[model samples]
Target: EEECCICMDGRADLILPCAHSFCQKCIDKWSDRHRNCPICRL
Candidate 1:
């Protein structure tokens, strides 16, 4: 159940500090355009 929704054919390798799991690559990519978690945006 480690599949990530950010990108196709990717595994969630990073956990947000708040509460959620996302692909490491996806998170890193969002670092520039966005900030914080998806649900727990902070």
Candidate 2:
């Protein structure tokens, strides 16, 4: 698996609807601010 796009850490345990993977911490923080995928914003 790839690292978190926001934190650059590969501890991702969540999978987005867009098929992007991110750490729960990063995704929670990112989703709080954005509604799209952090990688492609899909």
Candidate 3:
């Protein structure tokens, strides 16, 4: 496991267009205002 590091407390369940992944719940809060990846931001 231990793949994603976005939440650091949970594994990635959602996929992004930037080839990055994050938690569905975490990303939901982040993506509300963000339009890009958290790390790549593109």
Candidate 4:
């Protein structure tokens, strides 16, 4: 049930192209300037 990192947070979304997930609310704010996955940056 915890295969996904973002899913564990209960408030996250996966970043496309890299499949790296993070907190939706957190990533939404991060995506404002980020163009790739914060983890893999793909």
Once superposed on the true structure, which residue ranges of model 4 sit more than 4 Å away at CA?
Answer: 1-7, 31-34
lDDT of 3 at 27: 61
Off by over 4 Å in 3: 1-3, 32-35
TM-score, one value per model: 0.43, 0.45, 0.46, 0.38
Per-residue error (Å), model 2, residue 29: 0.7
Ten residues in a row with the worst lDDT in model 1? 32-41
Q: Candidate 3 residues 1-42, lDDT tens each?
A: 333556654576756666677776776677444656667753
Where does candidate 1 stray beyond 4 Å? 17-19, 32-35, 39-42
Local distance difference test, per candidate? 0.59, 0.62, 0.61, 0.52
Inter-residue clash pairs, candidate 3: none
Per-residue lDDT tens digits of candidate 1, residues 1-42? 465655734666865554466776766677523546665553
- For model 2, residues 1-42, the per-residue Cα lDDT tens digits are 555656767656765566666788776666444656745744
TM-score-wise, the better of 1 and 2 is 2
**Which rank order by TM-score, best down to worst?**
3, 2, 1, 4
Best by lDDT: 2
lDDT at position 21, candidate 4: 56
